[PDB]
Amino acid sequence: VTNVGEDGEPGETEPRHALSPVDMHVHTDVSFLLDRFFDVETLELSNLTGSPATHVLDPFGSTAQLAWARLLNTCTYFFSDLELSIQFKFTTTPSSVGEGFVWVKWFPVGAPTKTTDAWQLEGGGNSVRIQQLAVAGMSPTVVFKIAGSRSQACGFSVPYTSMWRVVPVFYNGWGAPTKEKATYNWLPGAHFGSILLTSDAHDKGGCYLRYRFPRANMYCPRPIPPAFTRPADKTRHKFPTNINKQ
Amino acid sequence: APIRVVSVPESDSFMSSVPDNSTPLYPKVVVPPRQVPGRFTNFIDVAKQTYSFCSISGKPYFEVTNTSGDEPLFQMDVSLSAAELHGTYVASLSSFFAQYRGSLNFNFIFTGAAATKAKFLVAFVPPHSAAPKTRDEAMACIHAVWDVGLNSAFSFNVPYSSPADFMAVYSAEATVVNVSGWLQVYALTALTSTDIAVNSKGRVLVAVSAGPDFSLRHPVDLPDKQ
Amino acid sequence: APIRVVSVPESDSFMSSVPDNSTPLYPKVVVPPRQVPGRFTNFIDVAKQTYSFCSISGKPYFEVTNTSGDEPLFQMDVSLSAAELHGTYVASLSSFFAQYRGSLNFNFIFTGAAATKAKFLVAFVPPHSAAPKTRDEAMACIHAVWDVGLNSAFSFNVPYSSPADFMAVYSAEATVVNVSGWLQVYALTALTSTDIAVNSKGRVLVAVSAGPDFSLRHPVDLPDKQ
Amino acid sequence: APIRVVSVPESDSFMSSVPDNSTPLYPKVVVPPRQVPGRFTNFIDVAKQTYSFCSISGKPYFEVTNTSGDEPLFQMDVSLSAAELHGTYVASLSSFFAQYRGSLNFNFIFTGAAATKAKFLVAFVPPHSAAPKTRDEAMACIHAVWDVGLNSAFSFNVPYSSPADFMAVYSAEATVVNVSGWLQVYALTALTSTDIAVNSKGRVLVAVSAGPDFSLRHPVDLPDKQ
Amino acid sequence: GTTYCYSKPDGRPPSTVSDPVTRLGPTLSRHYTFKVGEWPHSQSHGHAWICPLPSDKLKKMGSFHEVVKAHHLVKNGWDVVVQVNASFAHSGALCVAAVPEYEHTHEKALKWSELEEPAYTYQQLSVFPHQLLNLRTNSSVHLVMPYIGPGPTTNLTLHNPWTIVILILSELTGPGQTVPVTMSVAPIDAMVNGPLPNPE
Structure with missing residues (x-):
């Protein structure tokens, strides 16, 4: 009605002159926001010996009070590639480790996973055994030493290996014919694969997994x-900040 | 033949957001065609093409009754940290950023019965000593008269007025870039009905959208909950 | 003049499959011409242009006798991890990869004498509660009638039917990307012969080939034997 | 494929003024248009287009009285470290650099009343045994006669005369590149007035500007205060 | 007014089935009409009738039901019209949305039920394809949805991509009687795969 000012x-509104652009909406771009390293997960190393289990790379159903957690939950289906940064931080005395090789193995979505120590290295009496699936081969094996290391880390890029054309972040149905409370918001292979961290350190420290x-x-x-609670009616939330009145 | 190279001091460091990729170890994977509808590329677009309902006392609306007048029915300070903007998409998207720029579009939807009618005066009050308490006071400001029964829905744009090019998403004790004023809605007339015993009150739903000139910059990490 | 360089944190690491070569230390070796027939460049081609025999109870065939009817003579679940696909080239090649896509071609060769005859009904049954037990049940599905004595060999294509673009090579407890159903072969009629004392049974060899649309991706390392 | 590289010995060092940038970690920020008047790009321009007042005994001027003659009213040695150049823009800007080149422009402004008059002789005396004590001595040098009452303001250029292409900003015990001589102002006649009881003295403000050929080079860090 | 959810439906056959696909014509996948429930004065804002499509009502979808029942996979969209029967003295408003992969349902999976949405959800349900049903202006909502899912087709027994959420934003006031919520559902561009065995 009447429109302008x-x-x-009744129904008439006053004139508004829209503002000119400046920032160009670059920062609200979906792929720009996600192409950065996020500290998601922290994890323990497995001993060289035994029958370890692989850790699945699935950052999707998170509750973590972190920016990547909510953000990944803003869409119904997701597709992206992946980059990892694995770091290693001592939880004991750094002088406990004199060599400290860490074997990292990444597995594409669908890869077989049973491993037991099986590859023996021999030298002057004593010997060292590594996992069947830690050895360098078909899928990527990365080996870094933690001892004198200036960064006690490694990193590499890996692609989207799922069989689904898109990963369902939410799924109204079951991923298996048997409809068990378990397979509910499920769907097999809705992830990035899995890794296996293995080392004579294992005690002595942990890792830090970052995804890009x-x-x-x-x-x-x-x-x-x-993200935050609701302030009182007619008020504003007040947060500590850079700006704030001194 | 070996190239003379000098290692920078920031050498073996991490730096999380470097504008460059890591080395690839699993090449040549061709990914299946992903048809699938509804892809979005920028959060600002879904913020502008979509509306959420405000949280007025925990409900998505304010009420007019057959006894109203003077006092403001709805009042919220213009800041993305405002309470009534709490459950909204625009407010929630904002927490990912440090600064915002632009207008907010509010649209009120009268859901009182067809046998019901009322008139509202909605005002945008700029920063001031203290917020008007009655409508005769606020009506000196930018305002619009909404006669329901002419249009059941009414859109009002809260403008951006500030000496700074962007304002803060995360508010705090009032600063010059914290708050932009108040949005208030008054009842120009109380609710009239065909039978006051059947319809004594009517509810106005209030929804928010990002305005055409709205923008968000500076992605930020989430602080301790509060 | 020395170039400012920053050492990435993943610096002195190994990474087994880097897309790059090591430094050469024994240059200029010209290799002799290698004529030699039968070079192959892709394993999928030899999988498609070649057939292997299945392992039905340890033998490469199933039998029809003069007493048969109802019950299935051959049954295998559609998964590369199936038992009857055990000694085959396609199954064995598959263990090097995580996922597969496409159809499998099965061809049955009746090796019963020329004085012998029988008819088979071969069906592809999709995932279901539990697999048909008689042919009148399965015949509701995709099926073909093979009358030996018309052609002694018969090719049947097990299709790819799934909501996923690829399925798993390594099966396990039934999942939506584990199994694709069952392949069954029934006797439409029992074996007839010119003299039942001389020929009482006939054997159908069953061979598998990769279908035209078959493919394998994601090379994987061998896990503990089982 | 890995490139043969040789690490220079000055490898992991800092070097504060390297002609190169660090790695960026917060890309794509478009900055708001900054209209705002009065941007300056080179300090030498504001030094040349602007004047400051000297510090003659703590005041920005020297005085002539009805009793004057012979002796110099103003005397300063030509060095940016001179006392009377103390509070000035040109002197203060100079402390950021090691060397200077060029002339200085001084302009005297007579602020005695309109009913007042006097004449000055201003001389530039080159380095010498010891500075003249009377004007008949200095008048052998480069000088100008300023008759107030012809022009109330008078500009005089102290030239650059030296065998070196630049001289030192930071002076010390006299060296060949430390000092360039003296600037003196004498009273050719004492102040005359319409009534000596009303106006007995008049003040000449003295201001300095960088000359057209003035320049500063070699940025230097601030030493201990003195 | 018709609202298309994300896009218009297509009749393209699934990229991932190399077996014969049967296109059900309109006269085969017909249209079915249900009463969703009754909106009462006592129910409060946030309350929602959750209607996954179809799965608890597939058995009442006559023709379509018979065909779907006999095959393994199905790709298809839906054409739904939700209505409300209220007088011009009734006040209130609903938000009826079409949600892809809706979940909350505490595994009462694929059953039409009623729940209380959690605030940030009812406030933002408008972010999904929807239409407001204000009792002072209109009585219907019309939504048309394309097939959607992680893969080119699904098994309706295990997955219901689309679920219709009818949510109370402004409570029912006015005459004491309730307002019945009604819904017509018509499968659209349905394609069926791999026939199952005979049921003996």
Whole structure:
């Protein structure tokens, strides 16, 4: 009704002159936001010996009070590639480790996983045994030493290996014919694969896993959960900040 | 033949957001065609093409009754940290960033019965000593008269007015880049009905959208919950 | 003049499959011409242009006798981890990879004498509660009628039917990307012969080839034997 | 494939002023248009287009009285470290550099009343045994006669005369590149007034500007205060 | 007014099935009409009727039901019209949305039920394809949805991509009687795969 300004008639609104651009919406770009390293997960090393289990790279159903957790939960289907940074931080005395090789093995979505120490290295009496699936071969094996290491880390890029054209972040159905409470929001292979960290350190320290998601694509936006509580009616939340009145 | 190279002091460090990729170890994987509808590339677009309902006292609406007048029915300070903007998409998306720029579009939807009618005065009050308490006070400001029964829905744009090019997403004790004023809605007339025993009150749903000039910059990490 | 360089943190690491070569220390070796027939460049080609025999109870065939009917003579679940696909080239090649896509071609060769005849019904049954027990049950599915004595050999294609673009090579407790159903062969009629004392049974050899649309991706390392 | 590289000995060092940038970690920030008047790009321009007042005994001027003659009213040695150049822009800007080149422009402004008059002789005396004590001595040098009452303001250029292409900003015990001589101002006549009881003295403000050929080189760090 | 959810439906056959696909014509996958429930004065904002499509009502989808029942996979969209029967003295408003991969349902999986949405959800349900059903202006919502899912087709027994959420934003006030919520569902561009055995 009437539309634009200053007569005050019913339905009439005053003039507004829209602002000019400046930032160009570059920062709200989906793939820009996800192409950075995020500290998601922290994990323990397995001993060289025994029958270790692989850790699945699935950052999807998180509750973590971190920016990547909510963000990954903003869409229904997701596709992206992956980059990893694995670091190693001592939890004991750094002089406990004189060599400290760490074998990292990455497995594509669908890879077989049973391993037991099976590859023997021999030298002057004593010997060392590594896992059947830690050896360098078909899938990537990375070996880094923690001892004098200036960064006690490694890192590499890996692609989207799932069989699904897109990863369902939410799934209204079951991933298996038997409908068990377990297979509910499920679907097999909705992830990035799995890794196996193995080392004579294992005690002595842990890791720090960071994910970077290059080439991200999101489908079907979903509600974004709050992050903070609701302040009192008619008030404003007040947070500590850079700006703030001294 | 070996190239003379000098190692920078920041040498073996991490730096999380480097503009460069790591070395690939599992080449040549061709990915299946992903048809699938509804891909979005920028969060600002879904913020602009979509509306959420505000949280007025925990409900997505304010009420007019057959007894109203003077006092403001809805009042919220213009800051993304405002309470009534709590459950919204725009407010929630904002927590990922440090600064915002632009307008917010609010649209009120009167859901009182067809046999019901009322008129509202909605005002945008700029920063001031203390917020008006009655409508005769606020009506000196930018305002619009909404006569339901002409249009059941009404859109009002809260403008961006500030000496700074961007304002803060995360508010705190009032600063010059913290708050931009208040949005208030008054009842120009109380609810009238065909039978006050059947319809004594009507609810106005209030929804928010990012305005056409709205923008967000500076991605930030989540601080301790509060 | 020395170039400013920054050492990445993953610096002195190994990474087994880097897409790059090591430094050469024994240059200029010209290798003799290698004529030699039968070079192959891709394993999928030899899998498609070649057939292997299945392992039905340890033999490369199933039998029809003069007493048969109802019950299935051959049954195998559609998964490369199936038992009857055990000694085959396609199954064995598959263990090097994580995922597969496409169809399998099965061809049955009746080796019963020329004085012998029988008819078979071969069906592809999709995933279901539990696999048919008689042919009148299975015949509701995709099936073909093979009358020996028309052609002594018969090719049947097990299709690829799944919501996923690839399925798993390494099966396990039934999942939606583990199994694709069952392949069954029934006797439409029992073996007839010119003299039942001379020929009482006939054997059908069953061979598998990779279908035209078959493919394998994701090379994987061998796990503990089982 | 890995490139043969040789690490220079000055390898992991700092070197504060390297002509190169560090690695960026927070890309793509478009900065708001900064209109704002009065941007300056080179300090020498503001030094040349601007004047400051000297510090003659703590005041920005020297005085002539009805009793003057002979003796110099103002005397300063030509060095940026001179006392009377103390509070000035040119002197202060100079402390950021090691060497200077060029002339200085001094302009005297007579602020005595309109009913007042006097004449000055301003001389540039080159390095010498010891500085003239009377004007008949200095008048043998480069000098100008300023008759107030012709022009109330008078500009005089102290030239650059030296065998070196630049001289030192930071002076010390007299060297050949430390000092360039003296600037003196004498009273050719004492102040005359319409009534000596009302106006007995008049003040000449003295201001300095960088000359057209003035320049500064070699940025230097601030030493201990003195 | 018709709202298309994400895009218009297509009749393209699934990229991942090399077996014969049967296109059910309109006269085969017909249309079915249900009463969703009754909206009462006592129920409060946030309350929602959750209607995954179809799975608890597949057995009442006559023709379509018979065909789907006999095959393993199905690709298809839906054409739904939700209505409400209220007088012009009733006040209130719903938000009826079409949600891909809706979940909450505490594994009462694929059953039409009623729940209480959690605030940030009812506030933001409008972020999904939807339409408001304000009792002072309209009585219907019309949504048309394309096939959607992680793969080119699914098994409706184990997965219901689309689920219709009818949510109360403004409570029912006015005349004491309830307002019945009604819904017509019509499978669209249905394609079926791999026939199952005879049921003996």
